[PDB]
Amino acid sequence: ELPKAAIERIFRQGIGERRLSQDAKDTIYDFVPTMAEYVANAAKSVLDASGKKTLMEEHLKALADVLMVEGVEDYDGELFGRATVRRILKRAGIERASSDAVDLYNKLICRATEELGEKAAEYADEDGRKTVQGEDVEKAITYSMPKGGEL
Amino acid sequence: ELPKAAIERIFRQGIGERRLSQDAKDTIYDFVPTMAEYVANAAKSVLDASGKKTLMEEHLKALADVLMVEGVEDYDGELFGRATVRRILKRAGIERASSDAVDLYNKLICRATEELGEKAAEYADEDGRKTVQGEDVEKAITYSMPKGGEL
Ligand SMILES: [Cl-]
Ligand SMILES: [Cl-]
């Protein structure tokens, strides 16, 4: 499982100097692992359609382009542990992956989390607040993800 | 280009017996072609990653699974013309497609449009209205699509 402390640091990379409330952390702890699983299942979908058994970079690049996550390749923030993210992929049915595929999946989910923090920060700004609150995170999820983030 | 009359009929398949305002039609005329293009570009992304040059059903099935559009394969409503949707795919870079791929792309964009109508209908219900209004469509787009529907 993705550690909560790492989820928080990564999300916080996107909020600048703002504070983060507990209900915001609660939201991201529930959501980020579900998003990671969703992304891993999507990666399997892009690879089973692809006629290959090995997950490669190009499969995760396609997911980033369709989820419209910006700056994935250039992401240089905190990453989860390789074995942890590889196990999420394995649970999604990914029997074989290249190291570069694993790394790009990791950059995708981490960058997506950071991007969520940026969006939540934007909602806090809208309400003239210094702290990112659970409502900002909820709105960021619904807006930014398909199906309102019910992933 | 996708005809507006067809966009409207398809969207209206999802609103039951509700009325549709002009600002709702305005919204869907702007949005549905952008969504169709987005989906076609995504289809290219899933096929260039895939090592194949021919778009096949399995590529559009992967997109449906990641956009979480329900009931695509079983869709039996109005479809756009094959040549029109094939040209959208060609513009997205799809040089070669199978007939079944084209048909599944068509079912995906049409079912996605109908599903948008269902979601918009749900927002009108929430406000105790019989007519689906531009605000319902806007909320349906933002909620249901990635990046708030800024596709
Ligand atoms: Cl690779
Ligand atoms: Cl096919």
The ligand with the least distance to the CA atom of B49 is 1
Instruction: Kindly determine whether residue A66 and residue B143, on different chains, have CB atoms separated by under 8 Å.
Output: no
**Quick one: which ligand is closest to B61's CA?**
2
Please compute Rg for chain B using Cα positions: 15
Method: X-ray
- What CATH number does the domain containing B22 carry? 1.10.20.10
Amino acid at A99: S
Query: If interface means Cβ-Cβ distance under 8 Å, which residues of chain A face chain B?
Result: 41-42, 45-46, 48-52, 56, 58-59, 61-63, 65-68, 142-148, 151
**Domain that residue A30 falls in:** 1-151
* Domain tally, chain A: 1
Give CA–CA dist A11/A87, Å, rounded: 21
**The tokens of B43 are what?**
């289809």
Alpha helices in chain A (DSSP H): 4-12, 22-48, 57-67, 82-91, 99-126, 134-144
Nearest-Cα residue of chain B relative to residue A53: B50
- A143/B144 Cβ within 8 A: no
- Contact yes or no for B63 and A61 at CB 8 A: no
Q: How many CB atoms lie within 10 A of CB B10?
A: 25
Task: Answer yes or no: are the C-beta atoms of B115 and B14 closer than 8 Å.
Answer: yes
Resolution of this PDB entry, in A? 1.4
Pairwise CA distance, residues B41 & A49, whole Å: 16
Ligand of minimum distance to the alpha carbon of A55: 1
Pairing, β B19-20 against β A131-132? unpaired
Q: What is the DSSP string of A10-26?
A: HHHTTSTT-EE-HHHHH
As a dihedral over the C-alpha atoms of residue A84, residue A90, residue A94, residue A99, rounded to 10 degrees, the angle is 30
User: Which is nearest to A86 in space by CA: A74, A73, A95?
Assistant: A95
How many angstroms does the Cα of residue B60 sit away from the middle of ligand 2?
9
**B125 vs B123: CA distance, rounded Å:** 5
Report the residue of chain B nearest A59, measured CA to CA: B49
- C-alpha A17/C-alpha B10 separation (Å) is 47
